[PDB]
């Protein structure tokens, strides 16, 4: 198995560079509205603690440069929603795709495409960690760089990067700018939650394990939902939501082991641990494949 | 800042995809200016798979038996030939999206996005490294062949792989696009294994740096070894030995952590006979070799 990205070309043909003074950061150019990070309004001092309200007002739309690549495209209008800036530009981006904005829940993974000046560099593979941040690989001037699914010809746009915390996760928005998880834009300390490991994903794993062969792990017993989810809380696994129960339908069916049967499998995993076993050739349980992702790479 | 591994960004190569179809067999081609470039056993039936004479074969074709689809448009072929195991389309237009490009062969233990593409549409893209025995840990299912691995330096888009196979083992085996074959394998359909594969040692001594400048050096040690001594100890558990080159290659993330690069060696020798005891470095229980010193850096 392996981590593997969406092709990145959609959304490299929306990047562009957004710049308020020397505060350069990436924003998303749809039709003829670029979305950014409003923080690229903020000074340092103010970044400090940010009145974004009051930093707006003094705001017209000549003090905004987007640019794509070195071309310059005229903001003709500005307005804030939650923690994003949305700037209305004069011209409608050829290259935009099919979208939808979408907020994901824990768990699910997308596509980052890392970004600097408006160029992208690099494209991975994120989870949505139940602690609300992932694991990425931002540096300064990453900010604006979005996370994305791909579902036929429709891009799918999740996230909006914003931070990095202390414990080297990072945090960011929806594109209707509403934070992920319980954190701020401002330059303040804050702190993950401690994170749980992602239940409906190991399970997805298992599922793959016994697709390819692999299922020494089975047991002939099944167990409820509420019993897993009480012991599952008590070894820092997340409890399973009835989404989980239905997105790991399709896994069931190509398996023929019902979503419970797997999850009294697992418990026993968690109860009796590895014994010195392998799946999937690791003593590690898997945890950023979902379902989906699975069934995308076997078939 | 964070480590992860990481593709290029794949739009230039993704507006060279096409779709290739002879016969009954359907892959993927790379259409740069007015050429169409794919795996060559295209051509073949069953029959023809065991032992194929393709100079044979693909003079008895005509270019109206290649159909060629962009989408929504089909491409006239006015003209075929074949250089090793890949097939030339010559076809009437040039592909608009043409980036700067080259054709390169990769030196084992070098690194590549690969996009991975089915009937002519990109599906996924990822990172590989080129395996000291000329294998490739991707992932690839039917339909795959004709996909492309690449670099990006500036804006030219340098191509080093187009797909062709997978090995019994679940490891993958592809030309680079002059058609010569990574390793000993063959665009034949029989069973191949690989030579013994090793480790790229330069790798796991770049991804251990990147594991301290992340703030993780649990495996770190006081010891000090020789070059001779680590290389030693490294071809006993089939790791590659390293080079001047390589040590010189890694001074940037020494100096970078002002840890020593035979310090680092002493601590990976530490690893190889101890192992890790359960612990993990950046999330992995094992020693990962698909990073170079080169992409540890651009990351940090
Ligand atoms: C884009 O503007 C940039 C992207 C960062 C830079 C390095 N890696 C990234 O992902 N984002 C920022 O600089 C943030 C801007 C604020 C208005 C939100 N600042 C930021 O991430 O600062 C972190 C905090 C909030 C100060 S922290 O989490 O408390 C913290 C403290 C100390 C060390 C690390 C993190």
């Given at each position: ?65 987007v ?10 209008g ?7 800036l ?27 495409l ?20 992932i ?62 490991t ?24 099944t167990?409820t ?25 399709p ?20 109860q ?28």
């Open positions: 198995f392996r981590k593997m990205a969406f092709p990145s070309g959609k959304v490299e043909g929306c990047m562009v560079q957004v710049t308020c003074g020397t505060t350069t950061l990436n924003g998303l150019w749809l039709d003829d509205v670029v979305y950014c990070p409003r923080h690229v309004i903020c000074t340092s001092e103010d970044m400090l603690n940010p009145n974004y309200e009051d930093l707006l007002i003094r705001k017209s739309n000549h003090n905004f440069l640019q794509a690549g070195n071309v310059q495209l005229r903001v003709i500005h307005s804030m929603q939650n923690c994003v949305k700037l209305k530009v004069d011209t409608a981006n050829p290259k935009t795709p099919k979208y939808k904005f979408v907020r994901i829940q824990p768990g699910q993974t997308f596509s980052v890392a970004c600097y000046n408006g160029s992208p560099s690099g494209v991975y593979q994120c989870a949505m960690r139940p602690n609300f941040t694991k990425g690989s931002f540096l300064n001037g990453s900010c604006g760089s979005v996370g994305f699914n791909i579902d036929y010809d429709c891009v799918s746009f999740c996230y909006m990067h914003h931070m990095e915390l202390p414990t080297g996760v990072h945090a960011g928005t929806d594109l209707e700018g509403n934070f992920y998880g319980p954190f701020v834009d401002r330059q303040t300390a804050q702190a993950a939650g401690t994170d749980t992602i239940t409906v994903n190991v399970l997805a794993w298992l599922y793959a394990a016994v697709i390819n062969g692999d299922r020494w792990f089975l047991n002939r017993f167990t939902l509420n019993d897993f989810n009480l012991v599952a809380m008590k070894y820092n696994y997340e409890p399973l939501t009835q989404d989980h129960v239905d997105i790991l339908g896994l069931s069916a190509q398996t023929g082991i019902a979503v419970l049967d797997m999850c009294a499998s697992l418990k026993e995993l968690l009796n641990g590895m014994n010195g076993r392998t799946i999937l050739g690791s003593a590690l349980l898997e945890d950023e494949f979902t379902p989906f992702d699975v069934v995308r790479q076997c078939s």
